[PDB]
Amino acid sequence: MILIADSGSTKTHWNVLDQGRVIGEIFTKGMNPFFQTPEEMGREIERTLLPQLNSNRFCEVHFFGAGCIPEKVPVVRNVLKGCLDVSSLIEVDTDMLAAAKASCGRSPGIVCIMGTGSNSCFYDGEKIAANVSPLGFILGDEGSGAVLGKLLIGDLLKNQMGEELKEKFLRQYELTPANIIERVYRQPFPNRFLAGISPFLAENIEHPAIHSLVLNAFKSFLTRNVMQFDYTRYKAHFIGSVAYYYKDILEEAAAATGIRTGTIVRNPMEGLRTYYST
Amino acid sequence: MILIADSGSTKTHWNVLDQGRVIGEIFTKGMNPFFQTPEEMGREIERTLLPQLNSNRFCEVHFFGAGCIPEKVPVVRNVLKGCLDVSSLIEVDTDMLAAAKASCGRSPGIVCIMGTGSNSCFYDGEKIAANVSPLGFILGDEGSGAVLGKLLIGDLLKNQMGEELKEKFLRQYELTPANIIERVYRQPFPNRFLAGISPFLAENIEHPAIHSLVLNAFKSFLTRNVMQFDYTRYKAHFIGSVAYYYKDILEEAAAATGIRTGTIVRNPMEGLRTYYSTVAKTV
């Protein structure tokens, strides 16, 4: 049996494959080693992963997660080693490489993540050969859920979208300006708060201000990130909730900027299953 | 004697006026009642204001500071009353009112602050009648020192401005990306860190991409804040370090958007002195 994980901001998605079949699909909390200690990760595995596994024993583990850079790989691997009995290999790498394997397989492409955060890289068919550091929801992460949320809230409360959308938004999420400021500046994981109010955009996509905010945000991600790669030579592939929920707009953004899209999918898990059983 | 104060994020600027003459000039830390307790404020005053005064007796005190919303007015007043011996009025109001009195006196006008943060309002000649909530360095505060810094760092690290400026910046400030990320996302007062590195812009304003970052930041401020008021009728006055150090580009931004500018000054102290000496002199 093999265990596969893609760990993002809000969640870790796990699949168990055996004899090329899916025999388990599991959500846990996100497991980013910058935000939690090994002890916390190990306890989270024990609490919420193990109860949905049919064994502690795996041939292979492939764990892909935000924040799993070379510095942090050993730490994560030792947690996985301590919790599971792995006979052969324990791969730990980034969510970016998950998306690349999922979307490109063994051939090159430009690969982007558009979820709570965003990211972009060039995958040479084996590994990530180049990348644009995302920089997070304040400084960067163009086109991300948290950035979309940031932009939306700023425009709403600044009376740039009119009174209808502003009041609809505040009433829908039962927010006040004061609540929002508190959340965004003085409460943990503002990026997750902002990404969680971002679905308003998809719900209201037919309104001009809403369409423009998304289109402009996407064009910004493309010009600032994807266009640093050789985008006239390679397809650009997109993985994540935002790539999927705003697919038509992403395609409009790509056509406006000259980018050639490949795969646009919700998450890398479907790709990885194909990757590991073919 | 009268005591005047303008409290901002980085510092509180104090003046002592004696019969229209400036006889004392003092900096302390900023005294935003949302960021410190009344006890912490009182101690800061005893530790840093009182030793710079040769007297604590005043006829009037006018304290203007960020965070001094009506709800916090008596909290602040009582802190000052404790420390200072005052015979007439202790007025406590917002830094926005300081800027307004400083630039407008008794006349109406659009009043803007551009420092570490930014803010805009319509002053009717007596008080702030309307305001655009600035929203902080993440959501808004367009054209502020914090947002200029945010724009600069994102552009530099995302290779938008070339290697030269990128290297020059990291070198000058002894920074590395992972260090910046730490300061911006995981450490206290990221806005102050971002404002603190924004001077790089003034220093390199001859660079076309730096000039352009600042122009577009400023245009964003004007379109998103100032233009919600009756800008085709009233002058927009600008008070702050950013207004001052980037005056020419602010003037350029205003010409481009159709805003008629009024006062552009470093800080409101010069204005408040005139205010209290002339146009609003107690007789």
Author numbering:
A (entry chain A): 2 to 279
B (entry chain B): 2 to 284
In the authors' words:
Unlike other bacteria, the pathogenic Tannerella forsythia, a member of the red complex group of bacteria associated with the late stages of periodontitis, lacks biosynthetic pathways for MurNAc production and therefore obtains MurNAc from the environment. Sugar kinases play a crucial role in the MurNAc recycling process, activating the sugar molecules by phosphorylation. MurK and K1058 are two sugar kinases of the cell wall recycling system of T. forsythia, sharing a sequence identity of 44% and separated by a single PGN-scavenging operon within the genome.
The dimerization interface of the apo enzyme buries a surface of around 1160 Å2 and involves just two residues (F34 and F35) of the N-terminal domain, whereas all other contacts to the adjacent protomer were made by several locations on the α-helical insertion of the C-terminal domain. Soaking experiments with MurKapo crystals using MurNAc failed, probably due to a rearrangement of the N-terminal domain upon substrate uptake ultimately leading to severe crystal damage. The induced fit of MurK can be visualized by superposing the C-terminal domain of the unliganded MurKapo (“open” conformation) to its corresponding C-terminal domain of MurK/MurNAc (“closed” conformation). The best fit utilizes residue range 106 to 266 and results in a Cα-RMSD value of 0.67 Å for 152 aligned residues, showing virtually identical backbone conformation of all the aligned residues of that domain.
